[PDB]
Ligand binder design. Structure first.
Ligand SMILES: NC(=O)c1ccc[n+]([C@@H]2O[C@H](COP(=O)([O-])OP(=O)(O)OC[C@H]3O[C@@H](n4cnc5c(N)ncnc54)[C@H](O)[C@@H]3O)[C@@H](O)[C@H]2O)c1
Ligand SMILES: NC(=O)c1ccc[n+]([C@@H]2O[C@H](COP(=O)([O-])OP(=O)(O)OC[C@H]3O[C@@H](n4cnc5c(N)ncnc54)[C@H](O)[C@@H]3O)[C@@H](O)[C@H]2O)c1
Lengths: 329, 325
């Protein structure tokens, strides 16, 4: 038995985490605090809404008065809440400083002021390290954020490290690569590709890597870090499946029992030239974490989910996404 | 780069004041605008002697005050960011002021730069405390951070914002991380000034815990020289560690001072206190030495003698700063 406070639970990874957690732990309870902003989708958890072990609290993690009350009553806290739209972070960084930095600060304060013994897991990104042409970053390498989004995520990581040592908290930090799977919004590469291909639409590919991690595997890692991770430690999480968009697309089509005629290579486009790579040996060695699904198995499960849940993504797709020739406008 | 106008934040502080005096003294056609909120660590007397110089102007305000700082940032050619809440113990007691000044303050200044003067030369001044403890060896700019207090955590958070903003808005900015400064104008509460003052009064010397804490000691003037070098020749998006290579335990520092002052090591009495303080801090400053040719102009031996002398000759300064404690 363990009561968990999951922030940003109405989002992509948060929802997957909550469903997984309640399914694997009959006696656990979850309180989901989500502000219902960018990326949130109540539909993600509508079938669990009334499960007695689940409670939804609409609010901002930056709301100390509200957050302290929730932190006071749980055994663990899994922090997924954040603003993560890069281009949006470049236009209006304020949004990111508030949710990513102030929000994490507020959670840390509520934890050390109300319940310093609570188990805290801070979820972060592989983007904090910046790009790398060859090799992979370990948790002992410096950070080099290239956007307000990653800079604010990086800033939040630093506060967690500091508060943990200052107030002797029981907190760990996780950093993962690109997630894919159920409940990911339609314009993301993999979902967009599956949707468009099922509709016989051309899949653009600008000018012929990134590590791809099946969301459930990320979820399993977080669970492991929650129950066995050591305080004051950062844990990189990666599947070691670095592929280019063309590679991803070719595999999706194959697994959809199709041909590659849908691939339309157009002229190249800006700022998609960087490689991100995480060395996840630490978590492998210490917590024995290993991916449970291969890229093929994860994509196959992702294909099946999107084809059977048109009810979910359909309301979310616009016109850019279903457009015959989107690479033109 | 001649005729350069500078906005110095936190200029009413220990390092800030030393920096301002040095720069105005060294560059006859430069100008300085000092913005300081007059909070902890502030002392107007530090610059009372040049406060009327035509090239100097003081502005009372917080760097977190966007409307006020934006106007100053727009008209200068360089920004040296020193302002910050830098007291470790106060940060543990009440971290809020540290989040505000260190994180919010830096964020606001960064916004002023990107929006009103993206071409200004910015130097963000930070600390060796961001890397945390290290038993053996030294940290390079390529090593992870591991702040152990709210003070160093918020300073570390500020460093990260600077890196991200610089790459996002193509700014001309660098970060500096130095070790323990010592020298003229440091408050009596600090180790070296306190030891000198106590010793000059035949009073016993309070060392903390066991005084085995290891720190690199950098003469404030060598630190400002390093800052000047980074300002004028440092590369954007680069971090520069600054260390003297004078690592000593607190006990060692005290014994040195006593010897040079003519007192006995019997005045030494360890008092116990050690919450959020760390055993050893050590920075590898090879980068700045190799690229910018920076090296300490004074050894610790020469620096501590200049310091001892300054305090004995300037009681007028620390007199009203000494409390009952
Ligand atoms: N999606 C990925 O591939 C990926 C990769 C690496 C790291 N991450 C990290 O994992 C975490 C979860 O991201 P996600 O992909 O599920 O994104 P998401 O955008 O789908 O959802 C974020 C959720 O958090 C909520 N939220 C945002 N700010 C909040 C605030 N201040 N208070 C309360 N709720 C708030 C939103 O309303 C939303 O439900 C983030 O911290 C992100 O940085 C995601
Ligand atoms: N003293 C050291 O040994 C040392 C070592 C490494 C790094 N540093 C760094 O050097 C810088 C200067 O520190 P210092 O030692 O002179 O400390 P200090 O405490 O003596 O002075 C700090 C100054 O900044 C001002 N200030 C604080 N917050 C402000 C805000 N929001 N707006 C405007 N002014 C503000 C104060 O009023 C004060 O005059 C800091 O960034 C610190 O982190 C100092």
């Amino acid at each position: 038995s363990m009561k968990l406070l999951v922030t940003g639970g109405m989002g992509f990874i948060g929802s997957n985490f909550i469903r997984y957690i309640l399914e694997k732990h009959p006696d656990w309870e979850v309180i989901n605090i989500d502000k219902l902003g960018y990326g949130s989708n109540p539909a993600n958890l509508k079938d669990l809404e009334d499960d007695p072990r689940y409670t939804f609290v609409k609010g901002d993690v930056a709301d100390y008065e509200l957050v302290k009350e929730l932190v006071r009553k749980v055994d663990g806290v899994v922090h997924l809440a954040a603003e993560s739209h890069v281009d949006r972070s470049i236009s209006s960084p304020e949004i990111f400083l508030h949710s990513n930095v102030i929000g994490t600060y507020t959670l840390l304060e509520s934890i050390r002021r109300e319940n310093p013994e609570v188990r805290f897991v801070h979820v972060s990104t592989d983007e904090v390290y910046g790009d790398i042409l060859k090799g992979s970053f370990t948790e002992n390498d410096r950070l080099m954020p290239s956007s307000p989004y990653s800079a604010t995520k990086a800033a939040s990581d630093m506060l967690v490290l500091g508060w943990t040592r200052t107030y002797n908290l029981n907190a760990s930090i996780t950093r993962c690569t690109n997630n894919y799977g159920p409940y990911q919004f339609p314009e993301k590469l993999i979902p967009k590709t599956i949707i468009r291909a099922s509709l016989g639409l051309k899949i653009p590919i600008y000018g012929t890597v990134r590590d791809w991690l099946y969301v459930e595997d990320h979820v399993r890692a977080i669970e492991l870090v929650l129950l066995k991770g050591e305080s004051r430690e950062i844990y990189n999480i990666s599947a070691g499946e670095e592929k280019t968009n063309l590679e991803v697309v070719k595999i999706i089509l194959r697994l959809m029992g199709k041909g590659e005629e849908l691939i339309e290579l157009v002229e190249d486009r800006p700022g998609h030239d960087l490689r991100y790579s995480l060395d996840s040996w630490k978590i492998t060695r210490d917590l024995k974490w290993r991916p449970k699904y291969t890229f093929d198995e994860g994509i196959k499960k992702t294909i099946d989910w999107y084809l059977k849940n048109e009810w979910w993504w359909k309301p979310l797709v616009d016109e850019r996404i279903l457009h015959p020739t989107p690479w033109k406008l």
